[PDB]
UniProtKB/Swiss-Prot annotation:
Complexes and interactors: Monomer.
Required cofactor(s): Fe(2+); Ni(2+)
Cofactor detail note: Binds 1 Fe(2+) cation per monomer. Binds 1 nickel ion per monomer.
GO molecular function terms noted in the UniProt entry: acireductone dioxygenase (Ni2+-requiring) activity; acireductone dioxygenase [iron(II)-requiring] activity; iron ion binding; nickel cation binding
Gene3D superfamilies according to UniProt: Jelly Rolls
Phylogenetic classification of the source organism: Bacteria, Bacillati, Bacillota, Bacilli, Bacillales
Site location (May play a role in metal incorporation in vivo): 102
EC number from the UniProt entry: 1.13.11.54, 1.13.11.53
Pathway(s) per entry: Amino-acid biosynthesis; L-methionine biosynthesis via salvage pathway; L-methionine from S-methyl-5-thio-alpha-D-ribose 1-phosphate: step 5/6
Reported function: Catalyzes 2 different reactions between oxygen and the acireductone 1,2-dihydroxy-3-keto-5-methylthiopentene (DHK-MTPene) depending upon the metal bound in the active site. Fe-containing acireductone dioxygenase (Fe-ARD) produces formate and 2-keto-4-methylthiobutyrate (KMTB), the alpha-ketoacid precursor of methionine in the methionine recycle pathway. Ni-containing acireductone dioxygenase (Ni-ARD) produces methylthiopropionate, carbon monoxide and formate, and does not lie on the methionine recycle pathway.
Residue numbers marked as site, Important to generate the dianion: 111
Reaction(s) the record says it catalyses: 1,2-dihydroxy-5-(methylsulfanyl)pent-1-en-3-one + O2 = 3-(methylsulfanyl)propanoate + CO + formate + 2 H(+); 1,2-dihydroxy-5-(methylsulfanyl)pent-1-en-3-one + O2 = 4-methylsulfanyl-2-oxobutanoate + formate + 2 H(+)
Protein's UniProt name: Acireductone dioxygenase
Family: Belongs to the acireductone dioxygenase (ARD) family.
Amino acid sequence: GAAAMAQIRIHEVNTRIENEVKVSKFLQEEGVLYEKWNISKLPPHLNENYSLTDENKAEILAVFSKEIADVSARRGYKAHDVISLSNSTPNLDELLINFQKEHHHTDDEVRFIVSGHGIFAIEGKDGTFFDVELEPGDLISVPENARHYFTLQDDRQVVAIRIFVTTEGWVPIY
């Protein structure tokens, strides 16, 4: 929907934080890095574009290269790429069930949304799960050892840049 930035839904009580400042203050308290990058830079032929060429991908990484350098140097990341998921993706179901289950990782999990939507569900330090619902222009870093899972929204499609330390730190520890 129409949200500009990320919003939070707390799990048991169902309450919502939507104000910009409170959202980022809240994520700060949970160790979740949040940044808003200037998505208006993205060329329009790359907006809501889900069948991505090798060229389209390289271009996407070219446009946010500065923002990537800054976050990769501030936080110690090394490599990056682009993935897209949609209803048309073969094995969608059999892929998603890997990130729909609660897992953690031994490195941070960093994603920047370019198109579509996602929801990260993160176990807060007080034991309660909260959602971060992401809009394009949203970069989130989910800290090492934090139990979480991932879900698409009802449009079942997302395009993202993944930033990682090593390929080997991507594994779900269930």
